Amino acid sequence: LISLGLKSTPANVTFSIVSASANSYCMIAGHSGGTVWFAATPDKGVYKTNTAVTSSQPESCP
Amino acid sequence: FTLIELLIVIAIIAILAAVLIPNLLAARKRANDTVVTAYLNDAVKFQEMYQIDNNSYTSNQAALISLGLKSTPANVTFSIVSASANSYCMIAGHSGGTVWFAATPDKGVYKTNTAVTSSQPESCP
Amino acid sequence: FTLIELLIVIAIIAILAAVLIPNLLAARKRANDTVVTAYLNDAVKFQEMYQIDNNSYTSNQAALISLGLKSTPANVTFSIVSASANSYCMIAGHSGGTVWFAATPDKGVYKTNTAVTSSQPESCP
Amino acid sequence: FTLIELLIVIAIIAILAAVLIPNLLAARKRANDTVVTAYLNDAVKFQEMYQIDNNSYTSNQAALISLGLKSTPANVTFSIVSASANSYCMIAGHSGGTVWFAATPDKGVYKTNTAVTSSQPESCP
Amino acid sequence: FTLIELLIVIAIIAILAAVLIPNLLAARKRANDTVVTAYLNDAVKFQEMYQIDNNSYTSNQAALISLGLKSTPANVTFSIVSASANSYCMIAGHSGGTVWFAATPDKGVYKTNTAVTSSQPESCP
Numbered sequence: 001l002i003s004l005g006l007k008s009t010p011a012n013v014t015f016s017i018v019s020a021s022a023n024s025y026c027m028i029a030g031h032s033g034g035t036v037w038f039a040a041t042p043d044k045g046v047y048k049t050n051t052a053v054t055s056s057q058p059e060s061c062p
Numbered sequence: 063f064t065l066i067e068l069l070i071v072i073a074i075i076a077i078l079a080a081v082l083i084p085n086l087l088a089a090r091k092r093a094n095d096t097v098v099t100a101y102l103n104d105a106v107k108f109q110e111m112y113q114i115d116n117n118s119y120t121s122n123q124a125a126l127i128s129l130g131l132k133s134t135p136a137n138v139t140f141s142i143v144s145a146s147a148n149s150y151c152m153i154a155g156h157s158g159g160t161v162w163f164a165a166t167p168d169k170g171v172y173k174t175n176t177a178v179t180s181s182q183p184e185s186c187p
Numbered sequence: 188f189t190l191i192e193l194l195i196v197i198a199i200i201a202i203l204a205a206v207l208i209p210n211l212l213a214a215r216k217r218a219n220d221t222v223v224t225a226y227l228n229d230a231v232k233f234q235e236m237y238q239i240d241n242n243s244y245t246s247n248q249a250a251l252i253s254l255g256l257k258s259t260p261a262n263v264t265f266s267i268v269s270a271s272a273n274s275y276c277m278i279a280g281h282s283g284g285t286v287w288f289a290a291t292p293d294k295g296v297y298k299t300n301t302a303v304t305s306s307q308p309e310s311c312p
Numbered sequence: 313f314t315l316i317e318l319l320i321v322i323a324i325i326a327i328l329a330a331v332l333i334p335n336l337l338a339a340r341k342r343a344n345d346t347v348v349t350a351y352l353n354d355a356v357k358f359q360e361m362y363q364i365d366n367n368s369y370t371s372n373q374a375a376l377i378s379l380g381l382k383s384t385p386a387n388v389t390f391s392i393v394s395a396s397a398n399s400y401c402m403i404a405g406h407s408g409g410t411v412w413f414a415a416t417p418d419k420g421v422y423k424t425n426t427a428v429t430s431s432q433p434e435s436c437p
Numbered sequence: 438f439t440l441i442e443l444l445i446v447i448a449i450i451a452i453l454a455a456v457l458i459p460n461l462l463a464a465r466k467r468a469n470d471t472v473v474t475a476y477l478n479d480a481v482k483f484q485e486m487y488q489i490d491n492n493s494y495t496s497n498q499a500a501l502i503s504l505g506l507k508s509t510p511a512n513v514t515f516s517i518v519s520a521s522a523n524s525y526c527m528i529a530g531h532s533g534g535t536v537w538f539a540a541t542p543d544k545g546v547y548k549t550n551t552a553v554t555s556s557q558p559e560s561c562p
């Protein structure tokens with residue numbers, strides 16, 4: 001994604017691509033001083049999860 | 063410009079970011095079924111061209127590719143289930159489409175009831 | 188620093204506190220109408236996808252949700268007023284928007300004359 | 313908190329109020345040209361539909377409106393300059409756009425050199 | 438309203454100004470490749486029209502332009518590499534696209550491996 005033009009992960013943001021395939025992805029991101037982890041999938045779009053950023057990041061899209 | 067205007071701006075950004083993004087999966091499903099339909103319509107043209115040259119239909123894709131049918135599209139699995147002097151059955155589906163499609167010389171190209179997540183049909187419905 | 192400077196400071200704080208804060212209600216009204224417009228534009232995409240699969244439009248929202256339309260947004264009331272093989276009418280509005288919006292396959296998504304505080308239109312204007 | 317801090321705050325408010333507001337006229341000009349382009353693309357679809365029914369193009373907008381073309385958009389002046397069995401010329405512009413747009417069946421929809429403040433072109437450039 | 442609130446506002450403006458602006462170059466690259474693809478699809482229609490009139494393909498763009506193909510798009514370099522009674526090869530690319538595109542009557546319009554910053558392909562891959 002960075003090769004194609006996505007910038008460096010922002011300061012204090014931890015971003016992960018949890019899984020991907022020919023047809024779907026799940027991405028998770030959160031700021032150490034935000035409120036909650038956010039998830040992105042091609043069906044649900046970008047949305048906020050129930051998990052606080054002080055907890056360990058979700059292992060999958062809620 | 064003050065912190066309350068900036069909180070309103072942040073709140074409205076959060077709203078627009080949630081609603082102005084389409085369901086990308088649903089859009090790609092319908093495009094993917096179009097790829098499968100188009101590839102089966104091409105396989106049908108090439109079955110008729112093979113019939114012109116050989117008085118029979120192919121059972122193998124490499125004969126159709128020789129005549130001018132392109133490589134099976136990315137993420138499309140295509141099979142010629144059966145063929146004879148007089149008929150064929152072909153099945154194709156995209157791993158991120160909706161359903162398997164079938165092609166026969168009588169029914170044309172048509173969609174089956176079987177979802178692409180299930181194993182492919184063994185015959186034309 | 189003295190009591191007269193501090194009274195001037197207090198007086199000017201009272202002025203800036205009164206004028207530098209935006210009308211939050213008016214801002215949220217226009218954002219809310221954007222949510223309704225966006226949700227009806229999505230419902231329209233899913234009516235076309237249901238038409239691809241069924242050769243008819245839905246009268247019920249759960250069929251659109253199955254295909255990929257998301258839950259009706261918070262404070263948005265959405266209804267499919269009528270549907271047939273060939274047409275639909277959908278109505279939606281946010282309790283803190285300006286007016287009810289309508290969607291039909293000819294007129295697209297458009298705003299009605301009816302305020303969201305009034306009962307929803309029974310049909311497409 | 314003292315009068316010098318409050319004067320600094322007032323001075324910086326005056327700066328941010330001057331620079332953080334976009335050119336609204338320039339933004340609306342480009343949106344307005346999009347309305348004109350979109351309306352001419354629709355008029356082109358309806359000219360082809362009228363051609364399906366009548367084997368000729370319309371010279372009058374009411375025939376296109378009957379077939380399903382919507383009312384001319386607010387502040388857009390649209391005209392069908394000429395039409396025949398085989399061709400049309402249409403011109404449209406928004407009073408607060410940049411330039412007049414033209415549409416013909418060969419050139420498609422395209423922007424002319426004539427500013428919207430000048431009288432509309434009498435023919436397709 | 439005080440200097441600390443105004444510094445928070447300035448700090449948050451600096452954040453939003455950094456993150457809410459898209460990569461414009463990446464967006465324009467994909468639009469530019471669409472222009473090249475569309476122009477080659479048009480050149481292909483006009484090669485077939487020239488074939489209707491002349492029983493051969495063109496090697497020169499001015500023959501296609503006579504028949505109705507428009508001027509090569511801004512920043513698109515287009516060439517007809519070769520042509521005969523039975524085949525053609527055309528190459529096109531936008532100086533700010535991703536890769537050179539090729540067109541032939543068998544493979545259709547397709548993207549090559551060669552970046553637009555490199556010299557154009559001498560033949561169809």
Ligand SMILES: *[C@H]1O[C@H](CO)[C@H](O)[C@H](O[C@H]2O[C@H](CO)[C@H](O)[C@H](O[C@H]3O[C@H](CO)[C@@H](O[C@]4(C(=O)O)C[C@H](O)[C@H](NC(C)=N)[C@H]([C@@H](NC(C)=O)[C@H](C)O)O4)[C@H](O)[C@@H]3O)[C@H]2NC(C)=O)[C@H]1NC(C)=O
Pocket residue numbers: 002007008009
């Ligand atoms: C986030 O943005 C900031 C903005 O200021 C900054 O750009 C960050 O740092 C990155 O950008 C730097 C300046 O451009 C560097 O590019 C740096 O490296 C990154 O980019 C490399 C080139 O794309 C990439 O390298 C590769 C490659 O070209 O494929 C990857 C492998 O290392 C590969 N090795 C092998 C064995 N396959 C090659 C390697 N080849 C061999 C045979 O060894 C090279 C050619 O020798 O190198 C890097 O891996 C990396 O992505 C980058 N900084 C950091 C910290 O990596 C930017 N952050 C990132 C990560 O992009």
Ligand SMILES: *[C@H]1O[C@H](CO)[C@H](O)[C@H](O[C@H]2O[C@H](CO)[C@H](O)[C@H](O[C@H]3O[C@H](CO)[C@@H](O[C@]4(C(=O)O)C[C@H](O)[C@H](NC(C)=N)[C@H]([C@@H](NC(C)=O)[C@H](C)O)O4)[C@H](O)[C@@H]3O)[C@H]2NC(C)=O)[C@H]1NC(C)=O
Pocket residue numbers: 124127132133134
């Ligand atoms: C899908 O399209 C993409 C587009 O980019 C790409 O073209 C794909 O790859 C294929 O195209 C390649 C470039 O042209 C290659 O052609 C490649 O091989 C295919 O085509 C061969 C020639 O038609 C074919 O070969 C044969 C033959 O000519 O009959 C078949 C047998 O292997 C045969 N062997 C025997 C024992 N009978 C001969 C063999 N002869 C002997 C005595 O050994 C040769 C002459 O040595 O070879 C290939 O089998 C194959 O179809 C092809 N790539 C791949 C992955 O196969 C394209 N995909 C396909 C499959 O067409």
Ligand SMILES: *[C@H]1O[C@H](CO)[C@H](O)[C@H](O[C@H]2O[C@H](CO)[C@H](O)[C@H](O[C@H]3O[C@H](CO)[C@@H](O[C@]4(C(=O)O)C[C@H](O)[C@H](NC(C)=N)[C@H]([C@@H](NC(C)=O)[C@H](C)O)O4)[C@H](O)[C@@H]3O)[C@H]2NC(C)=O)[C@H]1NC(C)=O
Pocket residue numbers: 249252257258259
């Ligand atoms: C709006 O989006 C939010 C996003 O967070 C959330 O997803 C909302 O809640 C819905 O999604 C939940 C999690 O997936 C649930 O799915 C929940 O149920 C909805 O989906 C059901 C399955 O599609 C649907 O059920 C059916 C069915 O599968 O056909 C419908 C009937 O109940 C049916 N019963 C009968 C008698 N025919 C079956 C039933 N079968 C039998 C024999 O009883 C099942 C198999 O036992 O169930 C539900 O009706 C429902 O749409 C859903 N939550 C709510 C509040 O319903 C989401 N909102 C909606 C409404 O989608």
Ligand SMILES: *[C@H]1O[C@H](CO)[C@H](O)[C@H](O[C@H]2O[C@H](CO)[C@H](O)[C@H](O[C@H]3O[C@H](CO)[C@@H](O[C@]4(C(=O)O)C[C@H](O)[C@H](NC(C)=N)[C@H]([C@@H](NC(C)=O)[C@H](C)O)O4)[C@H](O)[C@@H]3O)[C@H]2NC(C)=O)[C@H]1NC(C)=O
Pocket residue numbers: 374377382383384
């Ligand atoms: C642009 O869109 C907006 C969306 O809100 C709005 O719809 C605008 O207003 C138009 O739509 C109205 C509501 O439907 C009206 O239809 C209204 O009239 C238009 O449509 C008439 C019917 O198509 C049309 O009328 C005709 C006809 O039916 O042929 C045309 C002549 O007047 C004709 N008269 C004669 C002598 N031949 C007949 C007439 N017959 C006789 C014998 O007198 C009638 C039957 O009595 O009527 C109208 O001319 C008109 O197009 C329309 N509003 C306006 C301002 O006209 C919409 N804008 C337009 C112009 O469509």
Ligand SMILES: *[C@H]1O[C@H](CO)[C@H](O)[C@H](O[C@H]2O[C@H](CO)[C@H](O)[C@H](O[C@H]3O[C@H](CO)[C@@H](O[C@]4(C(=O)O)C[C@H](O)[C@H](NC(C)=N)[C@H]([C@@H](NC(C)=O)[C@H](C)O)O4)[C@H](O)[C@@H]3O)[C@H]2NC(C)=O)[C@H]1NC(C)=O
Pocket residue numbers: 499502507508509
């Ligand atoms: C791309 O589209 C844009 C859209 O705005 C614009 O139209 C571009 O410019 C072209 O269109 C102009 C306006 O119509 C001009 O037509 C212009 O010239 C082109 O078209 C000429 C007529 O088709 C063509 O001319 C010829 C001819 O008619 O055969 C070709 C030769 O020059 C020929 N000479 C000889 C010696 N055989 C004749 C010449 N005859 C003699 C005896 O000298 C003439 C009759 O005097 O002229 C031109 O060559 C040219 O294609 C054109 N502009 C440019 C820059 O050429 C459009 N771009 C193109 C290239 O079409």
Ligand SMILES: *[C@H]1O[C@H](CO)[C@H](O)[C@H](O[C@H]2O[C@H](CO)[C@H](O)[C@H](O)[C@H]2NC(C)=O)[C@H]1NC(C)=O
Pocket residue numbers: 120121122144145146
């Ligand atoms: C189509 O080719 C198949 C392998 O690619 C397979 O061989 C099918 O069966 C044929 O077997 C040979 C040709 O390889 C025979 O002479 C017949 O063409 C045919 N045999 C039978 C049992 O019909 C062949 N077509 C099909 C499905 O018959």
Ligand SMILES: *[C@H]1O[C@H](CO)[C@H](O)[C@H](O[C@H]2O[C@H](CO)[C@H](O)[C@H](O)[C@H]2NC(C)=O)[C@H]1NC(C)=O
Pocket residue numbers: 245246247269270271
């Ligand atoms: C859409 O579903 C509605 C309930 O969710 C309602 O059922 C509507 O009416 C249909 O009723 C059954 C299907 O449930 C019929 O076979 C028809 O689809 C239809 N009946 C009538 C009277 O048209 C249905 N769509 C609409 C509005 O017709």
Ligand SMILES: *[C@H]1O[C@H](CO)[C@H](O)[C@H](O[C@H]2O[C@H](CO)[C@H](O)[C@H](O)[C@H]2NC(C)=O)[C@H]1NC(C)=O
Pocket residue numbers: 370371372394395396
């Ligand atoms: C399109 O309608 C115009 C009025 O709305 C005008 O009438 C144009 O001229 C036509 O006049 C009558 C139809 O009203 C004729 O029988 C022809 O259709 C046509 N006459 C001429 C001189 O061509 C008509 N279309 C155009 C521009 O011709």
Ligand SMILES: *[C@H]1O[C@H](CO)[C@H](O)[C@H](O[C@H]2O[C@H](CO)[C@H](O)[C@H](O)[C@H]2NC(C)=O)[C@H]1NC(C)=O
Pocket residue numbers: 495496497519520521
């Ligand atoms: C297409 O036109 C080219 C110049 O625009 C060039 O002339 C190509 O070569 C032709 O040369 C003349 C026509 O100008 C001949 O009679 C043939 O059409 C052809 N000659 C050869 C060597 O084939 C012409 N098309 C191509 C690529 O042949």
Ligand SMILES: *[C@H]1O[C@H](CO)[C@H](O)[C@H](O)[C@H]1NC(C)=O
Pocket residue numbers: 122124125126127128129
């Ligand atoms: C198609 O023909 C090519 C040569 O043109 C190869 O022989 C290839 O093997 C053929 N495909 C089959 C297996 O029928």
Ligand SMILES: *[C@H]1O[C@H](CO)[C@H](O)[C@H](O)[C@H]1NC(C)=O
Pocket residue numbers: 247249250251252253254
């Ligand atoms: C949508 O499909 C789901 C299963 O995917 C449920 O059957 C649901 O009831 C459907 N909605 C309706 C009522 O059409």
Ligand SMILES: *[C@H]1O[C@H](CO)[C@H](O)[C@H](O)[C@H]1NC(C)=O
Pocket residue numbers: 372374375376377378379
């Ligand atoms: C379009 O048709 C309507 C009826 O459907 C009216 O007759 C109207 O006058 C028509 N427009 C014109 C003038 O062609």
Ligand SMILES: *[C@H]1O[C@H](CO)[C@H](O)[C@H](O)[C@H]1NC(C)=O
Pocket residue numbers: 497499500501502503504
């Ligand atoms: C296309 O035709 C025009 C006239 O209609 C000119 O003759 C032009 O030169 C032609 N293009 C070529 C060179 O084939």
